[PDB]
Amino acid sequence: LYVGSDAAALKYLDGTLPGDYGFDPLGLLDPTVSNGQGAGGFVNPRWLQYSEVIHARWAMLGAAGCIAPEILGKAGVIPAETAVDWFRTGVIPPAGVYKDFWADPFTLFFIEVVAIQFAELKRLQDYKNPGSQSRQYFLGLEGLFKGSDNPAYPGGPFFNFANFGKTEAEMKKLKLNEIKNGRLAMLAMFGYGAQAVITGDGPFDNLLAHLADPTGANLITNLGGK
Amino acid sequence: DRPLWSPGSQPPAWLDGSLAGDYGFDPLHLSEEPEMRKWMVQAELVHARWAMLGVAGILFTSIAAKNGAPFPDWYDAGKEAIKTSPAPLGSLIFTELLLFGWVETKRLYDLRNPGSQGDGSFLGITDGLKGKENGYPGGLFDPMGMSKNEASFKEAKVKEIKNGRLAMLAFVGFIAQHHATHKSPIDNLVDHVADPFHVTFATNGVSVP
């Protein structure tokens, strides 16, 4: 089924994308948008799909990293001092900073920005020039950076070492499920930020509040309404 | 032809059943590369062997403590050990690391190149310290040879890998029991056999809040 597919949007997109539910009211996948040669603008279908899948993976990792500490700290899996809210770890020092860490948060930020700058710059250079990171010697792991025709799905001996989806149907199902779970986690992280701003508590605490009292703890009661 | 991890499952192409305990339970498609296959086989063998050594030690200490010997529980036994041992902390860890580096580097370089340790480099020993198989050495490590005949050698390989798998399942059971009930494993078994219908994993353990 097409989930709310706007008409006159199917005129330029067929079913090749993983999700592709036909939802494009404003219109950004049109090849008439940013047509020409060279770099062009940022609104092109290749970059749109790439940023969509990267946002999906990052939001999925973020939702996992927002649920796992609070959930495991509600039980005895994670101790109470390390079971802080996701925004009270130190990502926002007004919200809260975990002082009992092995390093200063800015030192961790510098290590993180160096590592993720290496990763994302290699990713960008492979996006501009496919297979380019497999040529220049990096550490001996150049064969792991072979990539593929689609920059969203590089594969190789490391990114897909389970080599799942030998057939095309399994590839299509896996891509559709990945983009679906990523969109679900994008909406999830949206709700997590909204609840963190409004309620000032973890998402599992808000879920437990809604479970205990549906009408007494909901969006209407969150902002003072009845 | 052989029993697998699931009835009707297809064994992997890189798992032909020539290894010990080759039930085909490889759903992450690891050990597809032959060098990776040797690495995974050696890693599983070493992890299993240390698991059953530790499990035998823990079970012996626990049954001796239940019998009446002045032995503590397997948890936090290192604290009373370092309180009683003349060797201080840090020093003996470094000595056992010095002893473990040597044999493990020999094992790693025999895994990379079989027969590399049979050149007489270590005290002129050539027949000993030679790997008969990839993860299975021979010579000095086996004092008496029940591995000379091939059928009982294969049977012993299968028995070794299965008992090792059971023992590392027993080790994760050990850590789960001592994080849930905080009692000795022999005491836990005694509690289970005393009242099986009531002394379960949830009534006494922390597994359920």
Place this chain on the structure above:
Amino acid sequence: TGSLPGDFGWDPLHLADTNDQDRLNNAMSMEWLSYAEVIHGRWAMLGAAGALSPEVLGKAGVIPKETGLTWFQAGGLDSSSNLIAVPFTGPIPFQYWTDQYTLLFTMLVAMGFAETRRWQEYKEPGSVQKQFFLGLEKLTPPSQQPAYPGGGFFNFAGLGAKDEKQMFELKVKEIRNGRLAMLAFLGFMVQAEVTHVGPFQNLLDHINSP
């Protein structure tokens, strides 16, 4: 179409008839939908039977009334950790032969075994019985249709050797009563949620006061 049982054409939401009709994966093929519907219906049959048995058997006095309590209280469906409807969590007033989580672990092990056998038969029929299963592999014969395996274990009475017309009539009666079980269990659980009493109590209230 009329080959599938209950092909009345009642599909207003159009959740069926997907383009990718692969039986393996995608969780949306018509054979998979029919299989899931019939096993959900059979589980609804069992749920309705188990939610009607203890109350009316305690009312009739066949079983003692101390154990003939309502289904949600005897099933662990209580507040517990404010989860409303989670089995094997709420405290049951009557002490049983073992702990709740004991047969919850037997739940996990045994039903995982049975469901993996069913999934392996669905993926590749005729291959599950090849492996040794302590002599229990021959108890479940393979079949072309995964929804209707047949054999000695699944058909003990042998009322499946007649012609295909009577078998199809039995199949459509079974799935029609399965949809009736769907409606009955939905009403069961929503009345138990909004009244916090057994279905027999509010059934007697409705009989006395229509």
Place this chain on the structure above:
Amino acid sequence: GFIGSPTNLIMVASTGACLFASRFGLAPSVRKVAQPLKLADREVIQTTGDPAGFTATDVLAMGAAGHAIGVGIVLGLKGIGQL
């Protein structure tokens, strides 16, 4: 805001009246054009199961109009001392 309050009742009534007007002639919508009367237009957006010309932008526009009419009525009645 409060469930059962007069403001809630009359603004729910206003939103429902706007939706009913958009569904059947009356208020101009996506499929309704021209200044004096309302004439049929192109479907523009697929309605996704809704009969006639009732798409997502239709319900968005008329929900916005209903909320605006409701808040205007509420504040006008509060200004004159009524409900």
